[model samples]
Target: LVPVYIYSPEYVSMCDSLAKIPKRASMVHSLIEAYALHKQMRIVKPKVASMEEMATFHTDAYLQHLQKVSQDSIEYGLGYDCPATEGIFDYAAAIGGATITAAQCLIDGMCKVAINWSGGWHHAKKDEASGFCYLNDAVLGILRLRRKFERILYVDLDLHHGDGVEDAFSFTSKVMTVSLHKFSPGFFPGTGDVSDVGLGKGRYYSVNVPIQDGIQDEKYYQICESVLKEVYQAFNPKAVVLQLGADTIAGDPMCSFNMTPVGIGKCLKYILQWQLATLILGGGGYNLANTARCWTYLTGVILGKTLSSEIPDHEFFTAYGPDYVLEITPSCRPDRNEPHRIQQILNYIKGNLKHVV
Candidate 1:
């Protein structure tokens, strides 16, 4: 697969200043370069999105208010998580542009795999923002892919549900949104229950695999393989937009799952095997060190290269210094997800695929 990585100096600078975890994306970029992984892919500079492009998935009113908010008048979430009195518009425009650019990279047949670490804000609604996402970049980029691909698949690997992306494309058979997440009531975004499949013509189009806490590496891929087998064979999407949020792995500050980077990378490798053009985007991950390492390892996975376990010395080198290694071990936390618990969900999704036609 031809792979391209999206990044720019100003884009990296802007993403760091506004992100909730602050400087996490910048650190991710830094680590990838430190390990010299970026050289393996084409790096594309992104343009700021015009109002016309941003309007593809967001309303003009919401776009207008985004310029006016110092962090939300919560009625619209346009500025809820974005506390910056200024530069809100700037960051949103750049990220949206970067993600769309990646989509174009796939659509133009120049790349089979597109990586944008600053992309994948799956919690933003068409009219509002939520869960630390200012713009629904996934939806916006998918809209671009729609120009060439009639059918597309959205695979959400974040620990939290991809409520906003699922909502954006739930009206037709053109796009299927599949999410694997921690779905109990106490979680941040609680909308992705198993019963909330899809509505009207899109019924069964939205697949939610509500996972429990503490899922390990091998079991995680097992669950993912079970669902994907049905999805690729049923939907047969021409292209894919995968939200590879690093939070699902162990060492996240949120501490939800026991997954390793290799585990998640296995999921990535499986999708690449589909041979459909794909746009890979980033999402939630609070532990900056692990997040950085996670993205680097994923980049390597895409390039068919494996890095040594010794952490490379970089500006962020101190962050990984305790063991100075590139790999992570699952925590001692027990995997609370029963085999039958997830089997039932996968069986449920298998039932839904029957209705995709």
Candidate 2:
């Protein structure tokens, strides 16, 4: 049995005002309530992550910069992308605490699955914020988990590379980062190449399953499961962090991949097949309505329950209107991930994995 823990108020009030589409935080929670999912999970009020905790992965200089309160400096990657909002530091601290608390729950054996829908700020680095991420909450959580778990596996499903997290643990074998993202020239924060495994002692510990645009479910499932299964056999990590960024789903503003919740859930179900204690996090999702549906469906998947294709009534009922259902219909965009290219990726990943032990 998996006891799941939900996030805090800062996620509702602060994380709500995202870099886009205000109140998205409440919308996600609202849909979950509409489905009666709150009863099945526990809600937690997280502590504001302390400076010491944040210092685990961030530099002191960077931490000092975030405290300046609307200084709006580009030196820390807080110019246009991560503008210094009014309560920027408070927002970062709450999200940091939320994920850190989620990690602590697993360590204390309080829950088998700990979810922070507001976490997964994967692009933030040790000294700088990038791609709308003000803090590296994912890294902080992993650092917390490493307190007990001997090895950690980070799986990123966002449209962009989890460059910050990868770089954070790129030289260590204790944590292995695996990202399934769209990688190409001109993409945002591009880094996760299949050839860019890891360095020195951490060599072969990093994995990148880069895909072309227009990736549908079955193909996505095949590549993700195939690569991850081999990784599990190779690494045998004790704890997991699945960064469930909804931007990869079809109709997302990113529109790089054409996946649906069904396919994402299929891949998720396969991962849960491992039954390891896991921390699920949210990342990129632009199309607000579709984001709500995707996360709600994912929550259902985690709870192991049923959801009607007929949208349930909620505060945001109207948003899901007009062919309202749980499923996201896939676009007709063809899969650009060639058959041979996929096989080559699989083969190359296998080649690198053999050296990890």
Candidate 3:
């Protein structure tokens, strides 16, 4: 019975700007609309995150640099994925606000679950934006909850390591970051190894499970669920943040992995069952249809809506062109139930946990 929040403005803003990349954000918005129509979910207005609040995670120098550049052209780390565009500051703030709103709603108990499709800007660092991220919303949300919880956990499942968030809280004990990503070895950022645990008070506060390609959903569920559920039960943390990026899917135009929409939903469901006040933030996913379906299912799950196997209407299907697969999903298989890779991860965690702290 959670109140599902729809981010329509994120779509509207995109309609106005023809210069930016539409695949990632627009695909998410389309899925949201389709899901809302199918489930009759209500859309709620989200507050705009302020620069002052964003400043907690980002440096003034970086913020000034971004604001100045965002006002002019797409500035700062503009390349293939994230481009410099006018109103980039406002757009980034909107994304930040969506995450903060969900965090507050979780704490206030106004909603047991909330999904912010715009959030999860994980690549942005304290002093700069990288990997298509202008501001790190996950870090900003943690700052918002710092007054309530002494110990906060941030879990990043993006294809790329959540290098920025890990780096931001790498030296702080108040926030603990766990990143399970594809370390494609010598990829961008080229970090998130087993030994890259936090320094000083945050010795074990940052944990990275950087695995290779071909990471199936079954293995992901086992390791992520096992580690997070065990830790949350033992530690009894006040709140948790999940960076839900869909780029882990296999054959993804941008990245490579075996994750699927149903697999992504399973991960979200495990987090929800924990009953921990959680903030779900969107991250990476290159393909439009995959990202849309993944996030749409996530929103549907949070709202207690059952997704149907029936395909959406033709008009909706046409919007995405030929790439869209309008069917439900490939059913999860049987052998996937046994994950040998997960056992290895768990064994490592159990064995090395003593040395971590």
Candidate 4:
């Protein structure tokens, strides 16, 4: 049984200071837990990550400040979005543990896949928090994967650029970071441009597929498969880390991309075909109902379990009411990314493939 790493109720406490109506990370985990139980999957509690493990990817000064300042550490971006709330250190540590445990499961040969709905803080840098992320667990998990695999592929499906992870490993060719995000001048991170490949020895190793607002399902799927196919052939990674940030889905409170949960699943299936030791991590997903539904559908996709469109009875069952179907309809937003524009982005990325190969 491939274990799904989940935290206890105590873990949900971390969201009290940060949660809005549908912007709770804990709620996302709670919904995932409910779905996992409903489907009777193997669930395991994650261990609290030790400080030493955290230091593997984070700076000592950052951890010290993170522990010492719980209210206002503006220097580290810990007050406004990421929030220097009480028990945040413990929360971040627990998330780290959950993600590391998932990757460790694959390394131990316990399973080819493991999931931690609590992980994937992709925007956190070594010494600072950015975009509501306090710690970079994805980087730490990738570090763990590096212990065994010669090459690792990290694919980020977040609304914003995964600048933290790309920057952390930008000098190394061992990990190829590919991010598909919404790009514009005033965008959140304002990175992941098609020209920003990689730095130094890591050139061509970092791939960015930047889309505009209102990207629909078919176009999204096309971009993903085309880029990922080339990436899988180029890097030929031994292990894969996928960051399935649900914010890209249409109904998310945070982003503008019009991807449905099922559309995201289709993109993911393309990667799963490679059959690498894969670690699945969660990132930004604000709209609570959509996030939960997206992850639940993705869980079924991962487990090869056919989930019913009629959501099963669970603690959060009522949340999905007012239609209550597992599949998501297309977004009401207009499609801003046109066919020719998408083709241009594709050409740019494919052109860069020459350097990588």
Candidate 5:
């Protein structure tokens, strides 16, 4: 499949090196070169999304408000987690545009899978920007796809629940949202309850799997292979969107799920097996080493290559430079340790699935 990418130099203008506290962003940023060096997959340039496109999912009043208050840090919906920046509207639109490009690529049958490193801004709402996301790229991307496809399955496995995406489609069953996140009753957004199915046409379309922290790679496969596998076959969606958020893994400062790079790969691999119109995106990943290495493995898998269990080659490492070591230690071991708490949560999620099917 020809990769339809839309990333450009203009998009990187808003990046504040200090603000990029999370290594995942830099790791993702570095991949532009790693992918180029590997010379296995195709690299397509990304284009910025237009304001009209963003309007599909976001409200006009809200978009206008941000445009008006972009200069004022206080009005840009800036907060402790999501800071208002200079020219944020432009930076955000570029990210949103890339996701839309991926969706367009799928709709046009240009590619089976279009992976965007900075497109899964899942925490942003229609009229508000939160959690470091001003624009809901995932929602906008799906909204574009809805113009052509009838059934689009949104699979969000980030440690944080897919609150923004879920909220955007609360009343519509045409798009199914399956969020597998941490559910300790106090997580961010504080909603993805096991029984919080969608209302109206969206009933039964909203599925949440609240797994406990410290989950092992093997156990995640067991639960997902049963639950998600059945779900996809039953739903038979016309298209699929997978949020590859690395926040669920161990060492992620954001949440408390224990998973290794190998476990994360398993999740991506299973979803790829179905091969139903798919767009895999990056979401909330805090640890750079873990997230970057995980996604590196993911890209290799997409290229049909085996997982390497050593430090990245000189070329890949050089692409990141000494800054990577200065920032965070990197590793490529796909299968590593697993946390015990994951077992209980996996069992609970598995138990609840009996009735859903």
Candidate 6:
């Protein structure tokens, strides 16, 4: 069974600002209604995360600053991309709560799969927010999972490095973090180098597969399957946290990966077969329509339903116009992902797996 967490109106209102339209937090709501799957899935109301719960991964000083919406909070990267919009603290607390609830449901055996479309703000750190992410829900959820499972796997499919989550558990063998992202000089954050595995006891526990631009579905899928399969065999995790960042799709205004919704769903299908206690969380997706389609298709995948490419008529139907298709066609960009390049990344990561797994 899958539990889908729905955001409260206040949470939606926080993301309803002019600057955040590209993040598409509300599109999922429109998608769920359009798909008519409300009856098929159990909807969970997200709880606001308590200060104690946040302290599991964040610092009290930072939490206190955020609580008062203090100007000092900006020093922690609060007002940059993560603007000091109204209700910032409450919104972030809700996001953390929803993601933690999903993991708790999985841990408590309430559901085999749990999803929070509003979660997966992976760029936040133990003390500060970064890259439009106000709270590191993935990290918080991982800490929550550690209460039950010792070996947890954090899989990040975002276009950017999962610096926050990887660094959070970079010194512990209890949680293995794997990030597959677009890597380049001068790129935002610019941290996921294949050679920069991990430090100390966490060495080799952090796996990074840095892909080039204009990567197509086949190459992306092949590398993810190979790398993740290797990590699973080596680590043998008891639970898995997958960060489904739709920004990897081609049409994302901020990213360059040439992926389609079909491709992302295929990757999810493979991961779902692992059958570990899995917590699915959303991440970066700029294009509203594509993000909605990707998450909706993923929702269907978890429910064991294969949705049609012909999109169902809904309120947002106009949003997906021109083709009116649910399945996104791959971009026309030339594939720069040479097989040899992929093999090199695969081999380097596989070699690193030898030290830990």
Best by lDDT: 2
Model 6 over residues 218-317: C-alpha lDDT tens digits? 8888888988889879898899999999999888887579898767777888888988888888888888898888888888888877777787886567
Q: Cα deviation in Å at residue 144, candidate 1?
A: 0.2
Once model 5 is optimally superposed onto the true structure by TM-score, how far is the C-alpha of residue 66 displaced, in angstroms?
A: 1.3
* Clashes per model (N, Cα, C within 3 A): 0, 0, 3, 0, 9, 0
lDDT value, residue 175 of candidate 3: 83
lDDT of 3 by residue, 1-357 (tens): 455463665544643353433655665675666655434544566777787888877778777876776652234565555665667777777777767777777667676556676677788878766877888888888887776677777888888899888988888767888888876556766788766778877676777776776667667777777777656654456678888887776545755567776676777787777776777787777666667777777777776677765446542466554545533333342232225555666666645444433
| Better by TM-score, candidate 6 or 1 | 1
What digit string (tens of lDDT, one per residue) describes model 5 on residues 1-357? 654444445454333232544334555556544545236544556677787988887888878876665565454467676766566777777778888888888888888878787767788988888777889999988888898888888999787889899888878877878887777766686788766767776666777776665556666777666668657755678788888788776666664777766676777788888878888788777776667766766776776776445444442365444454312222333423244544554455455434432
- Candidate 5: stretches off by over 4 Å: 3-6, 12-26, 29-32, 35-38, 72-77, 313-357
Cα lDDT of all candidates, in order? 0.86, 0.87, 0.69, 0.81, 0.70, 0.82
Q: Local error of candidate 1 at 143, Å? A: 0.2
lDDT agreement of model 3 with the native: 0.69
Supply the TM-score for candidate 1. 0.97
Poorest 10 consecutive residues by lDDT, candidate 3: 329-338
lDDT per residue, candidate 1, 76-173, as tens digits? 76444644357777788889999999999889877888889888889988887688788889999999999999999999998889999999978778
Candidate 2 lDDT at 92 equals 91
Comparing 2 and 5 on lDDT, the stronger one: 2
TM-score-wise, the better of 4 and 6 is 6
Better candidate by lDDT, 1 or 3: 1
User: Clash number for model 4?
Assistant: 0
After superposing candidate 6, which stretches have Cα over 4 Å from the reference?
Answer: 2-14, 70-74
Two-way TM-score contest, 2 vs 4, winner? 2
Q: Give stretches of model 4 more than 4 Å off.
A: 1-3, 12-40
Query: Whole-model lDDT, candidate 1?
Result: 0.86
